[PDB]
Amino acid sequence: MPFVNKQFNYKDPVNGVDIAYIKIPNAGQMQPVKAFKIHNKIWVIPERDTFTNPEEGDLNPPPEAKQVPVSYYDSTYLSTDNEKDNYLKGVTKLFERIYSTDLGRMLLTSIVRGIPFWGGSTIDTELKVIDTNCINVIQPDGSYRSEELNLVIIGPSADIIQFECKSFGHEVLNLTRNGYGSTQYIRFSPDFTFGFEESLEVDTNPLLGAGKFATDPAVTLAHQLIHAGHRLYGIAINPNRVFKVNTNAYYEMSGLEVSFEELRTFGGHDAKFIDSLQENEFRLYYYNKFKDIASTLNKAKSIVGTTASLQYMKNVFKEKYLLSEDTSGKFSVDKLKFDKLYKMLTEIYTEDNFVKFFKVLNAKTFLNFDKAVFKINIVPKVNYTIYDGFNLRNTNLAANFNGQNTEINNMNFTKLKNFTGLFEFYKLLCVRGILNDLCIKVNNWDLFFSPSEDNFTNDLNKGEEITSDTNIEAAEENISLDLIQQYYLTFNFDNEPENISIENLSSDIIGQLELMPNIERFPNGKKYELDKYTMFHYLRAQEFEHGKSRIALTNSVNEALLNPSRVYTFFSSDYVKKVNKATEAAMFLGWVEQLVYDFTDETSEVSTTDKIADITIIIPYIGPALNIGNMLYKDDFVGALIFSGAVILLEFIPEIAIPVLGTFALVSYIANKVLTVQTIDNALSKRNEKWDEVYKYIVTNWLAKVNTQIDLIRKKMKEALENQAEATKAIINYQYNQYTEEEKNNINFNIDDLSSKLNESINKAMININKFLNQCSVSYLMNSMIPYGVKRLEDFDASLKDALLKYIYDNRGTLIGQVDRLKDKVNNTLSTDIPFQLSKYVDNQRLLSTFTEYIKNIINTSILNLRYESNHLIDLSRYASKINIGSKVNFDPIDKNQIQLFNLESSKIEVILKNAIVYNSMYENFSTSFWIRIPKYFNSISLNNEYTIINCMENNSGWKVSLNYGEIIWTLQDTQEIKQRVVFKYSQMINISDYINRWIFVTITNNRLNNSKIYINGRLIDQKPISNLGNIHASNNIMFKLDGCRDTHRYIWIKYFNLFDKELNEKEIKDLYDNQSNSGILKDFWGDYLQYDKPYYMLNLYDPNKYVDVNNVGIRGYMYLKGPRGSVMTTNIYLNSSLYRGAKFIIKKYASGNKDNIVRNNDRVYINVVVKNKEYRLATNASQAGVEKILSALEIPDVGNLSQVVVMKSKNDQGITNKCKMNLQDNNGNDIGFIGFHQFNNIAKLVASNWYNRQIERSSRTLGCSWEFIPVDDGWGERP
Amino acid sequence: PDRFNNALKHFYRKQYYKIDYPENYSINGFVNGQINAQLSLSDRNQDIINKPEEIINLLNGNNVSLMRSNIYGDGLKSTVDDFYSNYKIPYNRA
Amino acid sequence: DNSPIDTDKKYYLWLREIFRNYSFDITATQEINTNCGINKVVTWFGKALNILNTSDSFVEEFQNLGAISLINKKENLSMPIIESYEIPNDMLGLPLNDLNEKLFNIYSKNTAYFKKIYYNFLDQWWTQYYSQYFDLICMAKRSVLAQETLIKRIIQKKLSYLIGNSNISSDNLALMNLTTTNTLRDISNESQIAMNNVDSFLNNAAICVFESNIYPKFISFMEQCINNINIKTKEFIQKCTNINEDEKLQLINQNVFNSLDFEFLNIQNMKSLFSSETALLIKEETWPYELVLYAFKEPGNNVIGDASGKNTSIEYSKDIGLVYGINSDALYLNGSNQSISFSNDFFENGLTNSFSIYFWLRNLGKDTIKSKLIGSKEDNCGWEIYFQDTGLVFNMIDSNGNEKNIYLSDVSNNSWHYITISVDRLKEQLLIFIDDNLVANESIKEILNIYSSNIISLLSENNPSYIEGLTILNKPTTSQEVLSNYFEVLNNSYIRDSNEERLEYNKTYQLYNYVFSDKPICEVKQNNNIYLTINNTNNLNLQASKFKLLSINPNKQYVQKLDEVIISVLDNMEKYIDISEDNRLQLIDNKNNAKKMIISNDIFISNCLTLSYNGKYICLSMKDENHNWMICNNDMSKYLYLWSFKP
Ligand SMILES: [Ca+2]
Ligand SMILES: [Zn+2]
After folding, report:
1. Quick one: where's region N-heavy chain nHN (chain C)?
2. How far, in Å, is the centroid of ligand 1 from the Cα of A561?
3. C439 neighbourhood in chain A, CB within 8 Å
4. Chains A and C touch (3+ CB pairs under 8 A)
5. Quick check: A922 and A930 in contact, CB under 8 A?
6. Which CATH code for domain C492-647?
């Protein structure tokens, strides 16, 4: 199902059909070029485009640099048949990549059926093609054939990375804005891409790579195909509609050119920059254009210049414009059909949405400017594939967008030289004699986007006339993957328009490109005199040039700006003193460790505030880092924020101008009761809209004027943080190079490992900064903007109330008998406020998506996630490590994630780790978690014998998990044989153990700067200092197997093994523990799934020393808790309470809706009781006096109408998690209460008592209605 | 009280409350439980004997008394003397 | 410098700020990184007791010097006197088997001895060290009381003075007096939070001192000890006459001790020390629940009660019925004569307290007319939730006439909804949630004294409804907690219909796909056999097809996660669902051939379900006829696998 069904090679000879030399329309003579028809109506010309526009035909750099941030010029590029063959293949591959997505498949189909309208006729009875919408295909016999086409991809002009849609015009008509459409020529190249900076994804991807990322070229092409799509359907927004910005202020950009069309195309937040009033204006504009095309078709009585029929042709356009055709053949445009189509072309086809489909890193907004240009090659599959792009499945490249990280993936990206110079376009900011002027240049695209107020137009102050008829615009729902799926499944993929025979055009086709408006080059190097250091100065002061000299950090911005060796820091003076000190070689490593710790400490700092509503956390160092607000201590910043709110972050205070809202005027209907009442209802409906309109408007002004300021501040904080890391590294690297060869040789110092560590610290810091800044931006909306809207709205409600009451009373004659009820409707409706809900107007704010990110964050930190799926045990992580399973490994049939490893060489599991994830580092934190079940130790041979179970040691360096008598052990070892062990001890001399032969949850976490920590069942057990350990280099594989165990009958159960690339905190560990406990299925004492038809000995959590017994069988007898349990022992090995003493319960299916013998929460069951090896039925007669119903064991045939049915419940328990409940019910569905016990005389009799059902959940730890089911298990094994 | 509950005299100054049976207290214990029971302060609180274990005299540079504060003993007998030094942890268990 | 307090309004504004500031001061904590972890530190501790108080900050000085820096006697330990190690001279000539199993006995005695030593160290810690942290805890707690007393006296003087001479109305002063009392309670509750803070802070510190200071002295003592033992045991084994050299090496190895034999530290056990019955009882008596409504059916009786463990009294109509709700039995109020009322002194609220109200509600929505559902009101103050239009209105009004009146749109669809309302006086913030969404976030700085009666009344006038899990809390609710409450309760293993009522077997539903939610499944024949599609030709007059779920078990009533199911339809006879070779679902004649499907659901989609066969999930095909067929295929968008049944 491919888009391009031929695989062309550039040297293939011309066939006259899909490979030919062709003439495109041109002003004067044009030299024929070799082109390829890759799909119906779509051609590719692998040539640098000097032909489209003979005016600019020279591939050299212009006299004056273009005012873009990135440009590249190479005249020789694409001059070779080899490069041509590669262009063709790359472009083709990108088409295929796009087509392979649901969204792209629609877009490509839309483009093909988007045939340019036949508007050529000056006589409206006839339908004619427009010439510039065609090409001439030169045949082998020297003749040419004229053929119409929608799309041509051609190589770029002099600026290699400037991609755009070009098309030819008409003497009068505007074909891109009139709905006619015109053949689209896109300048594109698959052989280059842009670099950009991304700090936002660290929330879900804490391991995100450092430095620049590369735009996926498929996104870039898609972007242009979207423009092409608009232009083909004649709905493109006029290029003179532009978003004006304020350039006059020192902090503002010198200028920026961006068009409504581009905003529309980008989608996402960029497109929400265009207000409702104008978005409406356009929809109506093109709707009328469509209506015009309908009337042009309706009056056309014949066709000209083709052998095709007027029927077929009119149908081509009926299918392009979604026209409705009545019984006569007349065409019109259904506002419903049009709305749907215009919506798909402008809200569904958007760069934003393609990113969602490709799953690639991409700039979230055009305001995140391309910082670099890169040479790439996507043709080889080892580089870039149709499905995965650069991020190749089942490899390191699949994780955290590494495929697009230019440093990690460096073989796929070669840095070219940006032709746009250093400070090519800038402003000059000068502080005044704080000694003479200190000036700095600021890059234009480092300045603030400040939209002009004449960008936001509203009719809010225009009144309306409410009418019996006046009717309501719909909700206008937001775009979502499921709405897209709606369009997708209703989309028609069958009918592509044929490639028809058309009358031959002239040998040369005469035409010129549509004129683009001339834009004023914005001013350059404007100078500004300032009294105070700015944000730009504070950031600039954090920079240095490379060199042999030793730099020092300073807390003085002034010093730093004045001296090349002085770099400003916002870290404490303590950090300053420490990083600057000359350090002896013998102390160098410990020095670095301290610096890395201090760095991480200071950048991780978060102050919580309980004082204010919408901002929970504050990052205090933002103040001294950017000079936000003013004064001195960071305690001033925390203080000023708490006091003044988010406004202190803003560079400028935006104007939010909301006028007196236009009041309603109601048309009266004399004597008509029904009309008068409808008018009243309509005025109230339109009132609800007035509220939604005002809210949309403010949200729109906030996205543009405020959220963009905060997004800049954010980008700058990452720049600040990276500068601090570079500075600290440079100082450390200088210190190391001061040493003697001999000193160095005794210090293993890896700058790449240190860099990696600091980059992780910067990520953690950005996570916090990101949250803080989001809350800040939103707080400003809620508190500083929305309220102006709410005041205008309440004044409007007041006016409407007076009007509506006046209307009711004036009409009391018509409205008689209803006057009171209408007053109430009006007074009650209009005395309410409609609350602003941010989640309604923008994508990222839903509550659930906060939890969603948290889950992502833990999943994306998992470098090994080992699960049993389908028929195999595999790695569910994006690295997809290989798993080798020994012949003697056993899998629990009931739950196959439960793995049993015996003591045999064949019983083993080996994970072969991908190289990118094998641990070799001084500084890198990591964690492991897994569940294990360890059989009781029966024999003295197990005493003082430590055996390994999970092995990651390589030449005495790595980690491992080992067991011993009552021990679970974690070992760390560096390459110098320095080791650290941390252990969880558990006794075997115990009445009843939380551990022995029970599923335990183990978590070990490793902080290389601090401590190694072991957790059991979610709780911290022991911690040991590891910071004296040097480089740890672990094994290329992980070996699950019993290594060194002298007990031959020994084995272990294990499940859910994970390896994490961070240090898990307490919260994450508990959440992990809880999530994996499978709370939907009941467990037996051992931790296994509770089962039907399996006999269990019973234990009551309230009195564990007691077991269940039966006084007498029958209705006159009862069951009770007896004791003592007695004990089982082997001297010196174990001493325990016997668990197999008692009567046995068997759970039987009653209501069960399948057969898997697993007992789920809320299963309805019977319980059978085993007494002297015979089966009876647990039952009671609930009619007996008293709320405690005494339970009996009855003959199974004799149960009659007694209460038997039991509802099984699964509860959470601390350090056990085994809590089971049983709620007994009669046959009418009523509750007889949970099963428990009660004292009668000195007997404790099993009882169903509703007193339990009146209690809240966990009350004390001592319940009486909580039970354990103990099956006979090989791991415990006393004599029944 | 769950910690050093035989030493409380040192950690705490007690203030006494009257309990009337059965208005404050009945067979179910305090009426409204141990937290929210409404009990009247005893007029005896002022009769409580105060005899500090030691008195902390806080003077200034001029050696004159600014404040005199009371620390109260636990009531228990003391030493004599150190138990941990002279106690042998038994190796044989009987 | 302000003009004196005259209005009652001015007294309230004053009293409230007095309360908020006291709370901010007294509950202040900062989390710090320590030797043993992160500890939540009481910020004022140094200024209160003059400890590490010579700095400008106690917090950073404590982070610096560590937990041991808070107490006056740092080294109290006494290395215990041991029983020196000698192996009997009578074993020197024993045979292996007997020598072997006799050293095994000595091995155990030793490791037990280690445990004893550790205990001895733990006792010294408690006696010598914890004793000093408990002194700190007590003094710090006394400091809190001393401060609290100062505050109350300040408040009492101001109230006493206004009552003494001011033009404030007699009735006004009366309310002021009642209200202030509630505020003084709110101040104790805040004091209590702070006294818990110093307990955790200082207990953690003491435990850190055991890890950082005592424990390592133990480890020193123990490696000297096992180094000795290791010596004597090696020297002994070499002197063994009756065993050979290969035996000696295997024996020495069996009997050797290393550090792991005595690393007994369990930090969770350290922490569990302080969880006593009393600590637990206190938790349960002081937790935020002021009302937790439970209900269940006894034979011939319906039980309604309150589990909060507070003083709440419940009075209700005798004939109120119970029906299964989301997770439990729900109350049915008929709208006419039925009402229930809950009484707790907390319910009256006041100026300074915070609270949350939540419950599940399903309303059979009819009238638009404003009607009391639930609220607490007296003298026209307090709060009420009303039924209005298609929604609810939350109303809040103080004694000065200031109001919150907030319309919550679209709550009566006759589907269950989870209502959460949060009133936070410390942040002056009102939060209203419907289900998993946050519908209102507002300032309530303008609302002052909401003192109402001690009775909350659930009326539900004119709108028969269902109410479940009604709860009142004395604290505010966050968005994380709401989401957690909402979803946790929602997965009990039950599958739900479009109204979030339990899906039942043998009940007639119509089938809808999540992507076209208003378009029911219909049947259409192609070649002398019949398939399932949806209607994309508006009013093509395809009839909504009628579905019934069947279970292999006659006794099974409600549909649960992972159940095996047979789908049936009533057309002329009863038709059962099968999978074709093209993976397109079709209605057939014979129940025997019917395919047994597994029904399940998404944890985050409450009213929807999923269907699978042999691991292949059920969804809607691409456009065809035009028709979109029900198919068994795994390659479509996730949204297409969500269905719901509407009755
Ligand atoms: Ca410098
Ligand atoms: Zn564009």
Report:
1. 1-282
2. 5
3. 835, 837
4. yes
5. no
6. 2.80.10.50
